[PDB]
Design a binder for this molecule. Sequence first.
Ligand SMILES: OC[C@H]1O[C@H](O[C@H]2[C@H](O)[C@@H](O)[C@@H](O[C@H]3[C@H](O)[C@@H](O)[C@@H](OC[C@H]4O[C@H](O[C@H]5[C@H](O)[C@@H](O)[C@@H](O)O[C@@H]5CO)[C@H](O)[C@@H](O)[C@@H]4O)O[C@@H]3CO)O[C@@H]2CO)[C@H](O)[C@@H](O)[C@@H]1O
Length: 476
Amino acid sequence: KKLFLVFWWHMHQPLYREPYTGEYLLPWTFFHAVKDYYDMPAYLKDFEIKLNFNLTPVLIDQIQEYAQGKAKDVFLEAIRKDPDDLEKEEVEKLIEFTKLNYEKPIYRFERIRELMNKEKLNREELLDLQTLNLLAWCGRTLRKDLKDLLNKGRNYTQEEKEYVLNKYFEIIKKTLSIYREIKEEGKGSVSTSPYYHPLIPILLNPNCVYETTPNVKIPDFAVSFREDASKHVELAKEKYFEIFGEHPVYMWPPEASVSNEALELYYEKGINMLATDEVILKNSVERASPYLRYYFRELISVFFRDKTLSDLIGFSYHAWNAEDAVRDFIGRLKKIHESVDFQPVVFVVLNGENCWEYYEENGIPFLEKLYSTLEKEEWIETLTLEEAMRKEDVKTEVIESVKAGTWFDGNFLKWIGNKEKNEYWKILIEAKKKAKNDYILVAEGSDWFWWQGEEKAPFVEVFDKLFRSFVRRAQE
Ligand SMILES: OC[C@H]1O[C@H](O[C@H]2[C@H](O)[C@@H](O)[C@@H](O[C@H]3[C@H](O)[C@@H](O)[C@@H](OC[C@H]4O[C@H](O[C@H]5[C@H](O)[C@@H](O)[C@@H](O)O[C@@H]5CO)[C@H](O)[C@@H](O)[C@@H]4O)O[C@@H]3CO)O[C@@H]2CO)[C@H](O)[C@@H](O)[C@@H]1O
């Protein structure tokens, strides 16, 4: 009797490319490409397990632009320059970026602490600040190759910084090829999402928010977004086909977001399986075991992720010693294995790039220990999405209706339903009436609404500038 374990690592960035200048206004796609997007599939070269990945089309576009040398990334330009050529504004931006990342374990360099404690920085100090900001985002592969430069910790020269940059761009240029390779070798399945990561259930039917939050106020949806919902899915299928040569049959719904209407749309678009969150199952049925394959109206297969396990990795284990965290995770799988007489399917689904910056050494000791341990436990079989979809010796159940929601508490409150988020929707609704190009689709991405109307939010003004620039461009 096996336990079937399915990892599905979701990779996404909103479009940081300002449409009028072409400038990438934040470096997050670059930094997660060099830290996570190559290295997460690359674990499959060293560990004999299956791991699955979701890549959004808008992320793929940006990886392609960086790989082609075409991305004009304003923060990265300030890193590359000789410090003697740095603008006053660029020095301020380098300092602020460091301050915002300062407490993350991947920034634990003694030299960064000294530099931040200085009033004015000379050329040699700025070179270290530039290069250490680069090296903080070093991924597993290059932590081996650049080991000696990493152990320097200070006193970096322009030549050394340029060397690091060249190795980083080499990783980016190989990234889409590693996803093709692990897919063709059967080491994992690759899925995609509707193109700009929108909330499909809201685009199809804004009133579905009232299934979980009846007291919420929403704007007047005086225009239909239903055909845009279809476009996001269709364009995503075409982009995936561009990269991999086949149409996708698995999709990750952005924010785990499903509704009866959304599931019908994914079925109509030829999607054979998706996953969503355990809270949706709990809201939709009484007997909510997430260890079964579900069939929605015999049209599409649905798995519900194990929320506990997914959130342990995504939010809890950064605060743990790595061996203890692996012991805890394996112990939880053992208890699931002992708790049922059938073979349970255990979906672990979360973002593949967001939690690691908070782990010691970018979570590399944790993942290496976790993957090494899993590959030797003969009662665990990790599966591709294709294998999870086909497995005959699992329990199944038919489901006829779901209550619409997301993996955020089963509801949509992170993107709609307060004064400030509703103004964004009102802006989008009015722009849609006058839209003349697909930049309206860019503005439908979930990220813009995530950041709106939130205190904290690092670089909130940049996301607001991007959203409103896409809204403006869509009407020209
Ligand atoms: O400067 C701002 C900000 O920018 C950059 O962050 C990027 C991310 O790197 C990028 O991935 C993208 O983030 C979006 C995710 O792609 C999207 O999936 C969603 O992820 C949020 C988390 O969702 C789940 O967590 C849920 C819990 O499970 C549940 O308990 C409850 O807590 O709710 C959570 C959902 O809200 C996944 O489990 C978890 O792993 C995900 O992390 O939304 C993201 C935001 O739209 O885009 C952002 C920028 O928009 C930069 O990389 C980051 O450090 C920086 O602060």
